Amino acid sequence: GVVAAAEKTVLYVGSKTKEGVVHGVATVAEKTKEQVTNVGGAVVTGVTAVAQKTVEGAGSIAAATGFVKKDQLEGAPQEGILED
Amino acid sequence: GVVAAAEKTVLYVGSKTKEGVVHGVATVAEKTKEQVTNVGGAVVTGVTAVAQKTVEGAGSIAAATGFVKKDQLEGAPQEGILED
Amino acid sequence: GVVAAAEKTVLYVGSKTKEGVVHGVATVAEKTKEQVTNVGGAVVTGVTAVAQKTVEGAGSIAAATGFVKKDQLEGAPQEGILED
Amino acid sequence: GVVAAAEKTVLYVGSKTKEGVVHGVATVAEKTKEQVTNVGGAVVTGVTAVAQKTVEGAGSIAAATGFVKKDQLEGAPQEGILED
Amino acid sequence: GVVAAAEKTVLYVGSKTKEGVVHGVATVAEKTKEQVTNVGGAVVTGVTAVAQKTVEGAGSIAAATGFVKKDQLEGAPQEGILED
Amino acid sequence: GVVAAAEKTVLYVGSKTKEGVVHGVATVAEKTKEQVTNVGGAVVTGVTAVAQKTVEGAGSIAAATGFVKKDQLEGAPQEGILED
Amino acid sequence: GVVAAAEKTVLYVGSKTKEGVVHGVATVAEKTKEQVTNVGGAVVTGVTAVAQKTVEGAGSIAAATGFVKKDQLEGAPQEGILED
Amino acid sequence: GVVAAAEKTVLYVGSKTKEGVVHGVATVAEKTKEQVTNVGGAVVTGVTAVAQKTVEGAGSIAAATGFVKKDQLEGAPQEGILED
Amino acid sequence: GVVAAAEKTVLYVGSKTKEGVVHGVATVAEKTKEQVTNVGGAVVTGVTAVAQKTVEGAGSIAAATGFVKKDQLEGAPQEGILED
Amino acid sequence: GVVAAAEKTVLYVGSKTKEGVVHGVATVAEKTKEQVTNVGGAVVTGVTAVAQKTVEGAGSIAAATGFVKKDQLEGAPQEGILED
Numbered sequence: 055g056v057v058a059a060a061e062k063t064v065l066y067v068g069s070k071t072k073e074g075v076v077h078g079v080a081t082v083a084e085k086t087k088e089q090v091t092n093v094g095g096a097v098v099t100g101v102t103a104v105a106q107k108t109v110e111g112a113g114s115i116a117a118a119t120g121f122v123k124k125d126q127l128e129g130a131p132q133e134g135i136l137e138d
Numbered sequence: 139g140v141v142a143a144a145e146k147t148v149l150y151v152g153s154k155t156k157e158g159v160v161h162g163v164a165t166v167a168e169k170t171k172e173q174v175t176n177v178g179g180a181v182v183t184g185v186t187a188v189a190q191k192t193v194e195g196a197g198s199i200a201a202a203t204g205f206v207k208k209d210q211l212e213g214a215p216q217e218g219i220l221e222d
Numbered sequence: 223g224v225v226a227a228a229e230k231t232v233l234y235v236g237s238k239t240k241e242g243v244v245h246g247v248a249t250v251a252e253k254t255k256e257q258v259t260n261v262g263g264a265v266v267t268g269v270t271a272v273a274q275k276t277v278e279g280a281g282s283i284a285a286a287t288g289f290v291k292k293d294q295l296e297g298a299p300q301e302g303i304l305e306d
Numbered sequence: 307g308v309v310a311a312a313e314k315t316v317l318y319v320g321s322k323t324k325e326g327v328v329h330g331v332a333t334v335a336e337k338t339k340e341q342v343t344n345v346g347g348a349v350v351t352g353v354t355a356v357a358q359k360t361v362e363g364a365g366s367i368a369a370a371t372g373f374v375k376k377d378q379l380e381g382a383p384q385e386g387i388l389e390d
Numbered sequence: 391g392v393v394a395a396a397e398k399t400v401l402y403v404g405s406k407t408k409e410g411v412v413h414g415v416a417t418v419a420e421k422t423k424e425q426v427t428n429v430g431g432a433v434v435t436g437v438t439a440v441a442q443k444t445v446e447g448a449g450s451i452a453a454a455t456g457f458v459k460k461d462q463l464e465g466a467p468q469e470g471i472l473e474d
Numbered sequence: 475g476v477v478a479a480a481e482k483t484v485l486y487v488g489s490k491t492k493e494g495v496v497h498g499v500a501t502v503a504e505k506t507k508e509q510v511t512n513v514g515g516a517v518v519t520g521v522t523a524v525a526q527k528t529v530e531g532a533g534s535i536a537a538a539t540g541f542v543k544k545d546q547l548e549g550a551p552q553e554g555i556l557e558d
Numbered sequence: 559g560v561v562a563a564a565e566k567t568v569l570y571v572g573s574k575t576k577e578g579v580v581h582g583v584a585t586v587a588e589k590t591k592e593q594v595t596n597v598g599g600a601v602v603t604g605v606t607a608v609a610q611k612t613v614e615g616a617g618s619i620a621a622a623t624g625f626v627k628k629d630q631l632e633g634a635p636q637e638g639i640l641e642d
Numbered sequence: 643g644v645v646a647a648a649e650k651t652v653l654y655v656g657s658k659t660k661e662g663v664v665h666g667v668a669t670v671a672e673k674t675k676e677q678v679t680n681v682g683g684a685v686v687t688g689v690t691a692v693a694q695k696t697v698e699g700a701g702s703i704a705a706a707t708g709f710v711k712k713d714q715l716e717g718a719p720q721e722g723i724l725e726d
Numbered sequence: 727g728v729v730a731a732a733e734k735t736v737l738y739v740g741s742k743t744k745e746g747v748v749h750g751v752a753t754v755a756e757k758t759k760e761q762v763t764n765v766g767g768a769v770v771t772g773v774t775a776v777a778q779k780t781v782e783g784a785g786s787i788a789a790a791t792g793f794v795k796k797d798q799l800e801g802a803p804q805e806g807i808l809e810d
Numbered sequence: 811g812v813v814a815a816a817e818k819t820v821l822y823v824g825s826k827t828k829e830g831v832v833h834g835v836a837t838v839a840e841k842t843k844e845q846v847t848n849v850g851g852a853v854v855t856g857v858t859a860v861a862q863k864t865v866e867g868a869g870s871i872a873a874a875t876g877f878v879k880k881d882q883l884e885g886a887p888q889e890g891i892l893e894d
Binding site: 066069084095108120 | 139140141142143144145146147148149150151152153154155156157158159160161162163164165166167168169170171172173174175176177178179180181182183184185186187188189190191192193194195196197198199200201202203204205206207208209210211212213214215216217218219220221222
């Protein structure tokens with residue numbers, strides 16, 4: 055793996071790794087408006103400076119699935135009515 | 139793995155790793171408005187400076203699933219009525 | 223694993239690892255408004271400077287599931303009526 | 307594991323690890339308003355500077371599930387009526 | 391495990407680990423307003439500077455579940471009426 | 475000056491002023507080193523969250539003058555010798 | 559000056575002023591080192607959350623003057639010798 | 643000056659001024675080193691979140707003057723010798 | 727000046743001014759090194775989030791003057807010798 | 811001046827001014843090195859988020875003058891010798 059060896063008989067020996075890293079982030083937001091309206095699904099908004107490492111599995115960042123329907127032998131409606 | 143060895147008979151030996159890390163983050167938010175309205179699902183908003191490491195499983199950050207329906211042998215409605 | 227060895231017969235030997243870490247975060251929020259209204263699901267908002275490590279399981283940060291319905295042999299409604 | 311050895315016959319030997327850590331966080335919030343209204347689900351808001359390590363289980367931070375319904379052989383309604 | 395050994399025949403040998411730790415946090419909140427209204431679920435707000443380690447179980451911080459309903463062979467309503 | 479008047483025959487009348495004010499300050503300092511060496515002058519360091527108001531005089535914050543020499547009818551030496 | 563008057567024949571009349579004020583300050587310092595060495599002058603360090611008001615004079619915060627020498631009809635030496 | 647008047651026969655009347663003010667400041671400093679060496683002058687470093695108001699005088703923040711020499715009818719040396 | 731008047735026989739009347747103001751500042755500094763060496767002058771470094779108002783005088787922020795010499799009827803040397 | 815008037819017999823009347831103001835600033839600095847060496851003059855470095863208003867005088871931010879010499883009826887040397 056990540057090994058460092060020196061055999062003396064100034065000196066520098068080094069091994070370094072980086073996986074899933076986020077450095078310096080600077081952000082300014084002044085006059086922001088955000089509306090979210092959902093009825094029967096999934097919504098993901100506003101994800102900033104996120105890091106991850108997964109070894110023996112599934113890695114997911116900002117993932118949205120509306121719905122999972124695995125039935126066996128009723129429906130699944132959604133109704134976003136808006137009027138004026 | 140991450141090993142460091144020196145054999146003397148200035149010296150520097152080093153091994154270093156980084157997995158799932160977030161450094162310096164600077165954020166300013168002045169006049170922000172946020173509305174969230176949901177009826178039958180999932181919503182994730184505003185995730186900042188998050189880190190993770192998972193070894194023998196599934197890693198997920200900011201994940202939204204509306205609903206899971208695994209029945210066996212009724213429905214699942216949602217109604218977001220808005221009027222004026 | 224993470225090992226450090228030196229054999230003498232200035233010297234520096236070092237091994238260091240970092241997994242799931244968040245460093246210096248500076249945040250200013252001045253005039254912020256937030257509205258949340260949900261009826262039958264899940265909502266996650268405002269997650270900042272979070273770190274985790276999981277070894278033999280599932281790691282999840284800011285995860286939302288609307289509902290799980292695993293029946294066997296009624297419905298599940300939601301009604302967000304708003305008027306003016 | 308994390309081992310450090312030196313064999314003498316200035317010297318420095320060191321091994322150090324970090325898992326699930328949060329460093330210096332500075333936060334200012336001046337004039338913030340927050341409204342939360344839920345009827346039949348789950349809501350998580352405002353999570354800051356949180357760290358965790360789990361070894362033989364599931365680790366979750368800021369997780370919301372609306373409801374779990376595993377029946378066997380009625381419904382589950384929710385009604386957020388608002389008027390003006 | 392975490393071991394440190396030295397064999398003499400200035401010297402420094404050290405091994406140190408950190409799991410689930412939160413360092414220096416500075417927070418100022420001046421004029422904050424917060425409203426929470428729930429009828430039949432779960433709400434978690436305002437979690438700051440929290441650390442945990444779990445070995446043979448499930449670790450969860452700021453987790454909300456609306457309700458668990460595992461019946462066997464009525465309903466579960468919720469009604470947040472607001473008017474003006 | 476700052477006056478407020480109301481003449482009735484909900485009401486709000488208000489006059490407010492702010493001069494030399496410092497609001498919410500959050501600061502974290504983790505591993506800081508500072509060396510100061512002076513021989514014949516003035517040094518000012520590390521001034522944070524300071525406010526002042528002066529009306530009929532001179533206002534000064536973090537002011538350094540090396541020396542004032544107003545003689546009338548010897549010298550003024552300084553010697554910062556450093557060696558290795 | 560600061561006056562408030564109301565003439566009735568809910569009501570609110572108010573006049574308020576602020577001069578030289580410091581609000582909420584939160585500070586964390588973990589591992590800090592500071593060295594100061596002076597021989598013949600002035601040093602000011604580490605001034606935090608200080609307020610003042612002066613009306614008919616000179617206001618000064620964290621002010622350093624090395625020395626004042628107003629003679630009339632010897633010298634003023636300084637010697638910071640450091641060796642190794 | 644700053645006046646507010648209302649003449650009734652919801653209402654809001656307001657006058658407000660701000661002079662020399664500093665709002666929310668968030669700062670993180672992790673591994674900082676600072677060396678200062680002066681022999682015969684003035685040094686000012688590290689000034690943060692400072693406010694002032696002066697009316698009939700001179701206002702100065704972080705001002706450095708090496709020296710003032712107003713003689714009338716000897717010298718003023720400085721010697722920063724450094725060697726290796 | 728700053729006046730607000732309303733004559734009733736929802737209403738909002740307002741007058742507001744801002745002079746010399748600094749709002750939300752977020753700063754992160756991780757691994758910073760700073761060396762200062764002066765012999766016979768003035769040095770100003772590191773000035774952040776500073777505000778001022780002066781009415782009948784001279785306003786100066788982060789001002790450096792090496793020296794003032796107004797003699798009347800000796801010299802003023804400086805010697806920064808560095809060797810290796 | 812800044813006046814606001816309304817004559818009733820929703821309404822909004824407003825007058826607002828801003829002079830010498832700095833809003834939201836976000837800054838990250840990770841690995842910065844700075845050397846300053848002066849012998850007989852003036853140096854100003856690192857000035858951030860500074861505001862000022864001056865009415866009947868001279869306003870100056872980050873101003874450097876090497877030296878003022880107004881004599882009347884010796885010299886002023888400077889010697890920055892560096893060798894290797």
